[PDB]
Amino acid sequence: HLTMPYVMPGDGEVVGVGEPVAIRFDENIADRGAAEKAIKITTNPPVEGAFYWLNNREVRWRPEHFWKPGTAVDVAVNTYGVDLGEGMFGEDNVQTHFTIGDEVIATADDNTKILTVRVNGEVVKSMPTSMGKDSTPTANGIYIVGSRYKHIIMDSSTYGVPVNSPNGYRTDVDWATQISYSGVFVHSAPWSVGAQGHTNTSHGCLNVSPSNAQWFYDHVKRGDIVEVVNTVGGTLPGIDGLGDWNIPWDQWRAGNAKA
Known part of the structure; x- marks a missing residue:
C-alpha cells in the first residue's frame, strides 16, 4: 500500500533532444490520472507536453516535437501521501532538474x-x-x-x-x-x-x-x-x-x- 516513484533523467543531467521525462513507480498504479495530477513539469522555454503510459508502472512525458536544445526542465513528483488508487499511497516526492544539450x-x-x-x-x-x-x-x-x-x-x-x-x-x-x-x-x-x-x-x-x-x-x-x-x-x-x-x-x- 506504499509506492515509491523514481524519475529519469537524473538531477543535473544533460540529455538529448529525444529524452522523455520518465516517472517509474515500484507498484502498479491503479489510478493513472491521480498520478498524472501529482506530477508537475516546468519547462524553460515553455513548451506543451503530455503524459502517456508505457505500462502500469511507468509514465512518460514529452512534447509534440523534439526538445529545443538548451531547454531547462524541472520535474516535481508530488506523490507523498497521495492516493494512487486502491489505497496505495505515494511514499515520497521527487524533484529533478535537467537540461537539453545539443541536437x-x-x-x-x-x-x-x-x-x-x-x-x-x-x-x-x-x-x-x-x-x-x-x-x-x-x-x-x-x-x-x-x-x-x-x-x-x-x-x-x-x-x-x-x-x-x-x-x-x-x-x-x-x-x-x-x-x-x-x-x-x-x-x-x-x-x-x-x-x-x-x-x-x-x-x-x-x-x-x-x-x-x-x-x-x-x-x-x-x-x-x-x-x-x-x-x-x-x-x-x-x-x-x-x-x-x-x-x-x-x-x-x-x-x-x-x-
Missing part, C-alpha cells in the same frame, strides 16, 4: 546504407553501415539513445529467445550504444566492414566500423536520436521503452490515463 540526430538510410550523424543540423560523420538482413530486418522508426557499453555480450536468451533457435543469437561486441529496450544497438563490427555500405548482415543491429562505433559511443548521449528509414522491416513499437516518438502526437496527447 544530435543520426539517420540510417537503407537505400544508401549510410548512418549520417548531424549535430545542430551539420553533418559531422557519415558512417557506412550494415543493418538487419532481410529475414531479421531493422525496424524503421525513431529510436531514443539509451545506455552505452564498452563491451557487451548480446545474447538473445536475455529476451527469452534460445540462442540455438530461429530468432537466436549470441555475439560479443565492443562499443555498443543501446537504441531499443528490445536489444537493438549501434556497435562495432570489424567482421562486416566490407559489407557496411553494401549489404545487410546483422540480426537487426546497426553494424559500423570500430572507429565509427567508438566515435558513436564517445559523442552520442542518452536522449539523442537515431532514425532508421527505408528498411524492409516494420516499425519500432511506441511502447518499446525507447520508441516513444513513434506514437503520433495526437494519440500521445490524448493519453491513456483511462486505459
